[PDB]
Each structure stands twice: as structure tokens, then as C-alpha cells.
């Protein structure tokens, strides 16, 4: 009665260690299945808080999505103006993951890069529209982020409870702030002034 008892004891201890999985403070985990996910709370995907949880070993898989505010910086790029005065603009964006479940699907594989890529195309494109209707003086003198704030409103809430697909709310993203690092007049434009 020693080999049978000792055998069960050792396997049980390793099984419990594999089943336990903790969620860090700045992270959130969504337990999944082989090809499906676990659905609880009246058909609503469940995201885990930073506490202890148990998962059947080898059946459940966890994907860790960071919940900390992410910083995305855009390199220098030229933005034509109403007077054709190209303005090299350096800017960064701050966003937070709102819907961890939706974000994982859209941005397949929970990679920060894909979300930043989508945001770069959207923000850059959105920014062009505002600068197009403004003059160089209103863009270098702007200290209340009017154009940057408007871009955020458009990205957060589009035009037409319904969540527009061209808004960042349709995805699990929330742009908390948008700022421009340097609006410095390029040399080409400055020469004529």
C-alpha cells in the first residue's frame, strides 16, 4: 500500500501547481479552451481580476492582455496645410484596453503592435483633415490642443448606444489623450517667411 499511495500523492501535488495561475496587477487573463472560450455570467466573456484562479490542466489556456496605459509614438511626418506649408509633426498617443475580449479577436493574438498599427493609420489620417482646414499660425500657436482634441473626439465617437465601426469604441481601445511633441516649422517653409 506504499507505491499506490505515494504515486497518487506526487501526481496530485503537481496537478494543483499546474492548475493554479495568477494574474499580475497590470495584466488581465481570459481563460480559453482548445478552440473555444469559457462563457459565464449570462453569456458574457469573463476577464480575470488580479487574483488566484484554477484551470483544468492541459484543457484551459490563458492569454495575458496588459491593462496598463500604453504609449504609442509617431515619428516625424509632413502634414500639408491650407497654404501648402508642410508641417513636420511628431506626436504620441495614450490608450487603454476597454474590451479585452473584443480586442483579442480584432487584434488577433493580443499584440500591442497591431493595435498601434491600426491607430497609426487612423490617427495620422484623421490628423490630416484637421490641419487641412487650419492655417500654419493656428497649428504652431495652438496651446489648447483643439485639433488634437477633435481628432480624439472623432476617433472615440464618430458621426452618422450603437457603436460606430469607425470609432475606437468598436474595438477594445480608448484613447485617453493625444499630444503633439514638436510642431516646429520645417526649413523649406521657414525660408520664405
Amino acid at each position: 500500500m506504499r507505491k499506490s499511495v505515494i504515486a497518487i500523492i506526487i501526481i496530485v501535488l503537481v496537478v494543483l501547481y499546474m492548475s493554479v495561475f495568477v494574474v499580475k496587477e497590470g495584466e488581465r487573463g481570459i481563460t480559453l479552451r482548445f478552440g473555444k472560450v469559457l462563457r459565464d455570467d449570462d453569456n458574457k466573456p469573463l476577464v480575470y481580476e488580479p487574483g488566484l484562479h484554477f484551470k483544468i490542466p492541459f484543457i484551459e489556456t490563458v492569454k495575458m492582455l496588459d491593462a496598463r496605459i500604453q504609449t504609442m509614438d509617431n515619428q516625424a511626418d509632413r502634414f500639408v496645410t491650407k497654404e501648402k506649408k508642410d508641417l513636420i509633426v511628431d506626436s504620441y498617443i495614450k490608450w487603454r484596453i476597454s474590451d479585452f475580449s473584443r480586442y483579442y479577436l480584432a487584434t488577433g493574438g493580443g499584440d500591442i503592435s497591431q493595435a498601434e498599427v491600426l491607430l497609426k493609420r487612423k490617427f495620422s489620417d484623421r490628423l490630416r483633415s484637421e490641419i487641412g482646414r487650419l492655417d500654419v499660425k493656428d497649428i504652431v500657436t495652438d496651446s489648447r490642443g483643439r485639433l488634437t482634441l477633435e481628432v480624439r473626439d472623432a476617433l472615440n465617437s464618430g458621426s452618422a448606444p450603437v457603436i460606430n465601426p469607425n470609432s475606437m469604441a468598436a474595438l477594445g481601445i480608448e484613447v485617453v489623450d493625444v499630444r503633439i511633441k514638436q510642431i516646429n516649422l520645417p526649413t523649406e517653409v521657414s525660408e520664405a517667411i
Binding site: R39, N43, P45, K84, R121, G132, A160, P165, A170
Partner: protein, 184 residues
């Protein structure tokens, strides 16, 4: 007794594999051999294995569609316009068996729609003033273009993105300005 064991073995696999759940952003499409059967909603459902199959269609995930090109204005001028069209899908009965490649089909519609609208307005207008009307017109025309098709894609909003002039004229077509500077 050996026959009973064989029946049990096949039935356990049937129930195990049969159970399937669909993610929240996807909508399974259960289909009979030839005919479609029903749309299953999220949770744990069962499908008789080898009889019906499910097709997950992403009803929530956004689908990007970048449409660009060197369009022609109404004054024989060239404008480098680029557009992005974010859209969603609807019940897969239309999306899947109405027109081939609905995602690609929308891109072709966007080119025809974008080309038509820009063609009416001038380059100078489209850059600063037309920005608002171009977005409205391009949105309305694109919807009308895919109405006969009956595809299940629904366009909510089409926001014009950029109309920057060609790089050749970005630092040209300013002789009047250079004359003003020379005048001054």
C-alpha cells in the same frame, strides 16, 4: 457483449466532438447537407457530427479597407487621395451566399464611389472646403452602389481621410505666390 462496447466507443466521440462553442465576435452558421439550417448564438451548443458544419463569421471585429488612387478632378488637375473604409458585417445568410468576396467587392465599390465624387469637385476645394461635403457624398454613394448586390455588409459611416496634392505640385503651383514674394 463485444458489440455493445463498439457502440459505446463511437457514441462517446460523437457527443464529445459534437459540443462546440462560438466566440463572442463570431457567429456560427449551422448548415444541413445542402440547405442552411439555423444561426447558433454563443454558449455551448451541440451539432450532429458529420451531418452539419459551422462557419464562424466575425460580426464584431472591425475590418479595415484602405482605398487610394490618383484620381482626376474637374479642372484637369491631379490629386493624390487616400481613403480608409471601416465597416462591419451582418447575418451570414446574405454575406456568404449573395456575392463573391464581399470584402473585396466593397473595395471595388469604394474606388468607383471615391473616383466619382472627387471627379465633380475641384482640387483646391477638396483640400480645405470640400473635406466635409466629400465625406458626406462619398458615404451616400458607396451605400447606393452596394444596395442592388444585397450583400449583408452594412456601412455606418465613411469618413474621408486625405486629399493631399501630388508631391510634384506640393512645392509647385505657387508661381502666383512666388510672384507675390518677388513683387513684395
Amino acid at each position: 457483449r463485444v458489440v455493445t462496447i463498439a457502440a459505446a466507443a463511437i457514441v462517446i466521440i460523437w457527443a464529445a466532438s459534437g459540443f462546440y462553442t462560438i466566440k463572442e465576435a463570431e457567429r456560427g452558421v449551422v448548415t444541413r447537407f445542402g440547405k442552411f439550417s439555423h444561426l447558433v448564438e454563443p454558449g455551448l451548443n451541440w451539432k450532429p457530427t458529420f451531418i452539419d458544419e459551422v462557419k464562424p463569421v466575425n460580426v464584431e471585429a472591425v475590418r479595415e479597407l484602405a482605398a487610394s488612387g490618383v484620381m482626376l478632378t474637374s479642372d484637369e488637375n491631379v490629386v493624390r487621395v487616400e481613403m480608409n473604409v471601416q465597416y462591419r458585417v451582418t447575418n451570414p445568410e446574405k454575406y456568404l451566399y449573395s456575392v463573391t468576396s464581399p470584402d473585396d467587392s466593397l473595395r471595388q465599390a469604394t474606388d468607383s464611389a471615391l473616383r466619382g465624387v472627387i471627379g465633380k469637385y475641384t482640387m483646391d476645394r477638396i483640400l480645405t472646403e470640400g473635406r466635409t461635403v466629400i465625406r458626406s457624398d462619398t458615404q451616400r454613394e458607396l451605400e447606393e452602389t452596394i444596395r442592388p448586390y444585397d450583400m449583408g455588409i452594412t456601412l455606418l459611416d465613411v469618413n474621408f481621410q486625405a486629399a493631399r496634392p501630388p508631391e510634384e505640385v506640393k512645392a509647385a503651383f505657387d508661381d502666383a505666390i512666388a510672384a507675390r514674394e518677388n513683387e513684395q
